RNA sequence: CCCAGGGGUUCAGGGGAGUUACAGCCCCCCCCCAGGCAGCAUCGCCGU
RNA sequence: UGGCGCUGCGGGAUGAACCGAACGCCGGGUUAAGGCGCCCGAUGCCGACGCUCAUCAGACCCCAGAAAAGGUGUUGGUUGAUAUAGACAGCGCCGAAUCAACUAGCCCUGAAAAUGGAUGGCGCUGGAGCGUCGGGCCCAUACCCGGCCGUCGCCGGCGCUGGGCUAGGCCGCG
RNA sequence: ACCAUCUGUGGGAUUAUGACUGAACGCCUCUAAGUCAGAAUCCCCCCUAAACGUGACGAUAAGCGCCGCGGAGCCUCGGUCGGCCUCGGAUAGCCGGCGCGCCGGCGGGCAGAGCCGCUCGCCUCGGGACCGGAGCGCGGACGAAAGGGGGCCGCCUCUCUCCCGGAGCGCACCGCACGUUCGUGGGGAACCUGGUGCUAAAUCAUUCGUAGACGACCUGAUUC
């Protein structure tokens, strides 16, 4: 019911153009690891694009002007909002279906995350072109939580790898059981191989 | 790091296009994008074809440069391309994928019943070895 | 379940005009125009719940109401379809579920 | 215009044992080991032959900007070869007119304290890169010796010392004082 | 249209808005960076501004015209009675900032500390922490408390300490003490929790927190001046005498475009009672309160190695508008923010 | 639910049977528009359907409905001929007992019936 | 079925060891437009 | 000469004049100009070929900022000149091509204004950029078919009565 | 009242520029790929404010909080119509198995183009199984970034479950829609039930003056 997407390796606008279309169709999308989102062009380009964004403020009262969020999740959230009619009740309901997170929080750490091939860097960008990470771009504009997120993501990959190694033993046990009971499932494996289920 | 190359005689699999699913022999390379393929034993006559719809296979037949279809057919039959392809896992996964798409409602019920008992028998064997190992 | 999942993506519109007498549905599995032919003519239903109870055919009254429609033609190249309902779909249904029935069947 | 194939072969001596893990080249010689990743060049590397090993750097369908990175791969590995067999010996020379440049090496060649440059009281503490050892040269008055296996680390450690002795607000054509690189050689001379 | 003669603006935009401080006790917004190498110590302490006086000392800076010369330097007396530790708080660093994970209060909490937990203490039953203190005695509460102490050592990265002042030892009318979290910057989390656990319901003197010849920061609220005009709030030029409709204003509050008064334009409002943090306040003397040594109460915290006069820090007639300093006090060079008897939160300097 | 098609009635409606002994579906009419025909066929060429099974036989008699003894006799007359030929097809007894429904990922435009 | 029967010439994205040899390519001749099957079926257009 | 004024409509974000097309009230269909990453209906084609990296990239009538002059950025083209009787470059060695001028695309330099801001916005760099094109698709009050209303035109019809002919009525057609 | 006095601060990426390695272009070259130093600029710390943002924790009044899927009912608001309980990532290589090797698999079949769940009930074959399965059940490990399960090894009660073949019963509602779920759902005010738990605060007035235009704010307010 919830489209959990991993933000690592994806482009900013390529992914936001698709996530904005899913929430308008009444679907709930959760984009994790927004610091891993890539942006085409060298880093100095995208950094200047954000520094020029920092200058856009109401001269008389900056507290009313454009709120410049520094977190990579809120940066990607503002990108998706730009492709939505957020000044209408239909567009505001679409924003309520999207939840962005820096890293992979516990509510989604134990989940299988989707990948959008139409937004990956390997598919949409040349191998020789320059790109930039949203985690470094945010760190150099005021994101104060890059070091704590990197350490928490570091421990998240340790417990995710211990689970994967246990999952590899279960697959080894499952493949071994298929050979030790092949005589009892011979009539069943012939049905699946007959209808193309197995090969 | 590369093992499959585009060369004279390289048997290629057409993923999409008008001849999707058939094997062709790259007899000549026109440009960086297109080639001159010809499948005499498959049903794809000599014609230009882009590389984006080709998928290189592990079969290379010995055909001369710009030889007509009579000699491209000999190397296709000398190397037994159709026999080696039909026994390769590439075609067997294609055959399995085609049969799964032609399954009727009664075929899915027979698969539902077969897979239901096949998993429960394997799942208990996994529990049997776990109890034995401890 | 005997119906296909569809989403009320919006009305038949241009950019500055909206024709509410025609709806654009998005079927969950149809992502190409060459796949919309199967659904041409299928019954559409916008099932929802209200406050007051209404009569139910073949059952007891409840809060469930429905607006029946039918897929008329395809729309674009991405598997979208057009549907006309006896009453124009309310704007609150945009992004909600539309049941695409398997009848009238042609298989 | 895109060239079909652009290759170049690198000769590898018998005392160097090279291992390829994708694009990460690892050379091991009598003077130590080196390891430099080339995953940003996007080329093909291959070791041909068991005896008299070679390194084949291939580039398929590359324009002029991408063909230029082919020899850069080869010239880098050749530096990694002579860095583990012969090494690199960059020699500095302290040039001064009136005030002699006092260089004292500390932390076992990992720190260079430059004193009495143009009579300045400020002390210039230049820390060498990892694996680079600096030493006051013998048989010479104001010569330094920078040794290491990686040319990019020894030549960079020489640029740190040289740019540290920079004259400000003066005619540099008249005030030619500083520690400059005089010779770029090897530790073993064959 | 440009101003012909340049002139700086009439204030710092970094102290906006010039509103009344929402709190009365100063708040340490940044503790010193935790270094596990140095021993375990506190980095803050609450004090009360008693009054100001001047001292005479011999400056010893080589190369100055005042070297080896007597000087009269204004100092401020901050009476700092010892604080009682009644709580430990563990903080876990999250991608959204620090978060309070666990909070373990002491078994016994004095009535002057419980006064902070009430708005009408006189007509309220003294029920605060009455059901919580039973956890230190019940076997179910002890086991739950042991799990909370282990949770701090395992999950928390910043261990703070809740402490309160002892207003019974002050000549002030207020009996309600001031609670405050004092971060521990000593070492590993296992040692910081053990050190803070053994310091529960135990007094901590200012002699252990700060020392002699130490640059510390003074945090607190300034003196409330009430509604003040722009001539006194931002120190602008007074308009000439013949100015119609007032002369203590700002003449032009902005150009035609933007057609809005700017936030940088100086306006009339509330002056004073602002939260401030002045740094580099050198401690001149850490005096000792009145204590009976050998049967007679000694009052000699204002005598020096060259004066030897048996006199207390309190001047003739006591500190005006404050009272009598009978406890340990600090002596800071210069002035500090706040009125008399103003609660000040002393903090170690964030700089080296 | 899955049924077995027997014969088309003069009014176009399809004479549909369960049989009753499998999925509790007696001999009754069924419109072809509201029916999905699968690719599974049983040889019922030997099954003799009585002539009196017309549209007036299944027309609602218009106060509680009750299956008469003629409906039960016509049911057992046809079921006694379908059951022996259904048993020749393995796993068809339970296939007719089962019900059809769309699960996650099953799309009718690509499902072959 | 190099279609077979007589053969000639020719280069190279040069096979075999430079001009067919342990592949082929092209240009030409005299023998039943050799026969046999397809007919805009890799490439167009149009119907009383 | 057309148009605006006297005129709405689709498109150009936007806007009296531009592009398309002019208007009774509706249904179905099809288009124009213009579009089809998301806002925003449509390419969610396994589109084709190239060009281009920009630390002020570029992004299409009217139209809403550029020039002269430059670049050993890159890609084309043109006209010449040296070279296996061994050139170019580097110290006779080296052993395969090399050099010069000119021209044309894109990018770059030239290129400085005042509240914070404008390919419309988000954003886009195996393209959502520029050029050349293909298939499909999107909708205007335009076009086609159908209903209803009114006007106008019929050398209109009916005094020859179940209904009918208040003929100043009724009916038919375009 | 500079007319007295006190205090006023750390880093990060980098601009210009100077360089390193090194091609293009046998040489050369700061640049093409890759690196270094680098500033009153920029960002951030320090510092001021604190959001239709929030964490921990205390105390919670004949009333009131937990615990009997309370045990039955009356008004209301939305969806929705099987789950996937998870490596890290590479992309000019990857994945799996076995002690730097070797073997095996790659248009991904150890495959998200996938996996898993999925006979209308109720009784009977014993043909295949030892699926020993099923808990309004009792315990124990594992969770702090926004703390764990519909899960796990354990003990326990009852008579189980799946596949392939036979024998039996069921309103078979007579072709027809809103069916089939999450759902013993989320929110109201009131019910009647039986186990357990405690019995407080805010505000006004008054007062203080560290405070104020008025509110607000800092305070004190009974027997030690
Ligand atoms: Mg000078
Ligand atoms: Mg007091
Ligand atoms: Mg006057
Ligand atoms: Mg006029
Ligand atoms: Mg006119
Ligand atoms: Mg415009
Ligand atoms: Mg229309
Ligand atoms: Mg548009
Ligand atoms: Mg010039
Ligand atoms: Mg320009
Ligand atoms: Mg018409
Ligand atoms: Mg540079
Ligand atoms: Mg640097």
UniProtKB/TrEMBL annotation, chain A:
HAMAP family: Ribosomal_uL13. Coiled coil: none annotated. NCBIfam families: L13_A_E (TIGR01077). Belongs to the universal ribosomal protein uL13 family. GO terms for molecular function: mRNA binding; structural constituent of ribosome. GO terms for biological process: negative regulation of translation; translation. It comes from the Eukaryota. One of its GO terms (cellular component) is ribosome. This is Large ribosomal subunit protein uL13. It holds the Pfam family Ribosomal_L13. Keywords: Ribonucleoprotein, Ribosomal protein.
UniProtKB/TrEMBL annotation, chain B:
The keyword Repeat does not apply. One of its GO terms (biological process) is translation. Keywords: Ribonucleoprotein, Ribosomal protein. Residues 46-119 form the Large ribosomal subunit protein eL14 domain. One of its GO terms (cellular component) is cytosolic large ribosomal subunit. One of its GO terms (molecular function) is RNA binding. Pfam families: Ribosomal_L14e. It comes from the Eukaryota. The keyword Iron does not apply. SUPFAM superfamilies: Translation proteins SH3-like domain (SSF50104). Belongs to the eukaryotic ribosomal protein eL14 family. This is Large ribosomal subunit protein eL14.
UniProtKB/TrEMBL annotation, chain E:
Pfam families: Ribosomal_L3. Component of the large ribosomal subunit. The ribosome is a large ribonucleoprotein complex responsible for the synthesis of proteins in the cell. Component of the large ribosomal subunit. Interacts with DHX33. This is Large ribosomal subunit protein uL3. GO terms for molecular function: RNA binding; structural constituent of ribosome. It comes from Xenopus laevis (African clawed frog). GO terms for cellular component: cytosolic large ribosomal subunit; nucleolus. Keywords: Acetylation, Cytoplasm, Isopeptide bond, Metal-binding, Methylation, Nucleus, Phosphoprotein, Ribonucleoprotein, Ribosomal protein, Ubl conjugation. The lineage of its organism: Eukaryota, Metazoa, Chordata, Craniata, Vertebrata. Belongs to the universal ribosomal protein uL3 family. Mg(2+) 1 binds at residue 172. GO terms for biological process: translation. Residues 17-30 have a biased composition (Basic residues). The keyword RNA-binding does not apply. Residues 1-35 are annotated as: Disordered. It is found in: Cytoplasm; Nucleus, Nucleolus.
TrEMBL record, chain F:
It is found in: Cytoplasm, Cytosol; Endoplasmic reticulum. Belongs to the eukaryotic ribosomal protein eL6 family. Component of the large ribosomal subunit. May bind IPO9 with low affinity. Component of the large ribosomal subunit. The ribosome is a large ribonucleoprotein complex responsible for the synthesis of proteins in the cell. This is 60S ribosomal protein L6. It comes from Xenopus laevis. The lineage of its organism: Eukaryota, Metazoa, Chordata, Craniata, Vertebrata.
